[PDB]
């Protein structure tokens, strides 16, 4: 329980500015901001210290918080889930292997069900061992119905198609679509993602209303090529930043939003059904800096 940034800024006076900002720079790198963002943040703080605008350790920390909040707000759309006006709305969850797609979908279904929303799940991961069984356990936990492929040769796009069709015929509010993990460097799996988006759109105009990219909070600067390629290929409407209850800080998410304008919409903070929180930028920046 040491607050790194609180403690280095306690040393600040005007004459210690360089020694303190050197320490602040190491603290941001260690939080996975990367050298490019860190240099920008630190250089803007050094100018505002030297012009006498920032006059204490806490003004510096407030200006540090302010500059990251500004980068997180460099988006074009809202952080709320944007479901459509058509029934059902369709949400796809995508991202690299291991990041937390299936768990986050279950936790999101739990939130929608608490709100009275009628949710249908689609087991679009037809590749990995026991992917359906795993999503089925989440369905039973959250009280959702689920569409599971009958055969082993089933295609992700066909499963999501049948599910979105079933959601329309039976008056579901939301159809939540799982998908198998894929590396943004795998051309044929990124193509398969384009086929799902096209297939779902043929049943409800405007579907999918949300395509949420899952980003593992343990990942360093590779978060940015991930978000770039996925967004280029299908169009990402929001981020899910998972595993922030660990010791990783997820600082690289700041440059993702800053470069791409994709709002962070949820954070994962554990493995239980309740451990999905809607993104609150003030809470996030306060947490990352102490």
């Amino acid at each position: 329980h040491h607050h790194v940034i609180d403690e280095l800024l306690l040393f600040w006076n005007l004459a210690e500015t360089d020694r303190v900002l050197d320490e602040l720079e190491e603290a941001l790198l260690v939080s996975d901001f990367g050298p490019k963002i860190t240099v920008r943040i630190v250089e803007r703080l050094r100018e505002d210290i030297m012009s006498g605008k920032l006059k204490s350790g806490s003004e510096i920390k407030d200006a540090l918080k302010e500059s990251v909040l500004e980068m997180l707000a460099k988006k074009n759309s809202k952080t709320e889930l944007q479901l459509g006006f058509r029934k059902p709305a369709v949400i796809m969850i995508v991202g690299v292997n291991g990041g937390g797609k299936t768990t986050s979908l279950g936790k999101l279904a739990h939130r929608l069900k608490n709100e009275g929303t009628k949710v249908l799940m689609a087991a679009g991961d037809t590749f990995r061992a026991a992917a359906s069984d795993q999503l089925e356990i989440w369905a039973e936990r959250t009280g959702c119905e689920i569409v599971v492929a009958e055969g082993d040769k089933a295609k992700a796009a066909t499963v999501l198609s049948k599910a979105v069709k079933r959601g329309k015929e039976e008056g579901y509010d939301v159809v939540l679509c799982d998908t198998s993990g894929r590396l943004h460097t795998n051309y044929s799996l990124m193509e398969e993602l384009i086929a799902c988006k096209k297939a779902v759109g043929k049943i409800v105009s405007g579907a999918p209303n949300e395509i949420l990219l899952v980003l593992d909070g343990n990942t360093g600067l590779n978060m940015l090529p991930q978000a770039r390629e996925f967004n280029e290929v299908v169009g990402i409407t929001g981020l899910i930043l998972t595993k922030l209850d660990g010791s990783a800080r997820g600082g690289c998410v700041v440059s993702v939003v800053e470069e791409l304008g994709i709002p962070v919409k949820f954070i994962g903070v554990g493995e239980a059904v309740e451990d999905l929180q809607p993104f609150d930028p003030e809470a996030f920046v306060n947490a990352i800096f102490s």
Binding site: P35, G98, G100, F127, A130
Partner: protein, 267 residues
């Protein structure tokens, strides 16, 4: 020379681009600069000192799996959530089965949904038996019972899969200690994601200090991350990376080549 102090701060940027942990970065730049001062062509020579230091830091040469002289070789896998432990378990069985060794997996993940069923399916794919237990026998006790089953069947290799856990989760790390104590393993391999960022040095150190590891397995190298997490493993723990995974197929397990990783990190 201290014209080379200039590109020296340039390789710090490049290593930090590559997700290399900042304390490992610092000791690398200082260790290289000190050799640059004494060693005394000058441009090709700095490239050689840097490439050679990366190769040295990461083990110099391949480290082989070490096997028990007289009993079944016992391999414990551990790591953060999602890094590929359950897949690597079956990959490892596929890899060691090809060397004539008979294998057995132990389904020690009793928390994640369908985790046992995932391991059971992968085992049937590579043709190795999978030991499973009833609900409400804890991981430390399935380690005990799985090891007894292995010794009774005269198996060459036992590989135990474990649930992902935070290295700061005291209860779950305590459970991992108990698993290890009852397994008495020959190898304890930390599975580490090649996309891991700056926490990698603190991650290895905590696992090595609380559990004690013998080496590591680096996964998802078919990604496009530079893999700077690789540079921390042997520098903070003394144990080498022994294997890499680069795909989802059962065959995608290979030896770790310090030389190849060096070129990838400065790639």
């Amino acid at each position: 020379k201290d014209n080379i102090a200039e590109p020296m701060r340039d390789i710090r940027r490049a290593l930090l681009e590559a997700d290399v942990s900042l304390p490992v970065v610092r000791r690398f730049v200082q260790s290289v600069s000190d050799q640059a001062v004494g060693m005394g062509k000058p441009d090709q020579q700095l490239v050689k000192i840097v490439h050679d230091e990366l190769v040295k830091l990461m083990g110099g040469e391949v480290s082989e799996l070490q096997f028990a002289k007289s009993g079944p070789t016992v391999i414990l896998l551990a790591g953060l959530q999602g890094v590929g432990k359950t897949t690597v378990c079956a990959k490892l069985a596929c890899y060691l089965k090809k060397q004539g060794k008979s294998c057995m997996l132990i389904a020690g993940d009793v928390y994640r949904p369908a985790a046992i069923d995932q391991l059971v399916i992968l085992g049937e794919q590579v043709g190795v038996p999978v030991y499973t237990a009833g609900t409400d026998v804890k991981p430390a006790d399935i380690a005990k019972q799985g090891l007894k089953e292995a010794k009774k069947n005269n198996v060459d290799v036992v590989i135990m899969d474990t649930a992902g856990r935070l290295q700061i989760d005291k209860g779950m790390m305590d459970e991992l200690k108990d698993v290890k104590k009852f397994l008495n393993p020959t190898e304890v391999l930390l599975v580490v994601d090649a996309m891991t960022g700056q926490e990698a040095a603190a991650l290895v150190t905590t696992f090595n200090v609380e559990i004690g590891i013998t080496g590591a397995i680096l996964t998802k190298l078919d990604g496009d991350s530079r893999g700077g997490a690789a540079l921390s493993v042997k520098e903070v723990s003394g144990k080498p990376i022994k294997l890499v995974g680069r795909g989802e197929r059962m065959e995608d397990l290979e030896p770790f080549y310090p030389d190849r990783m060096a070129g990838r990190i400065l790639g």
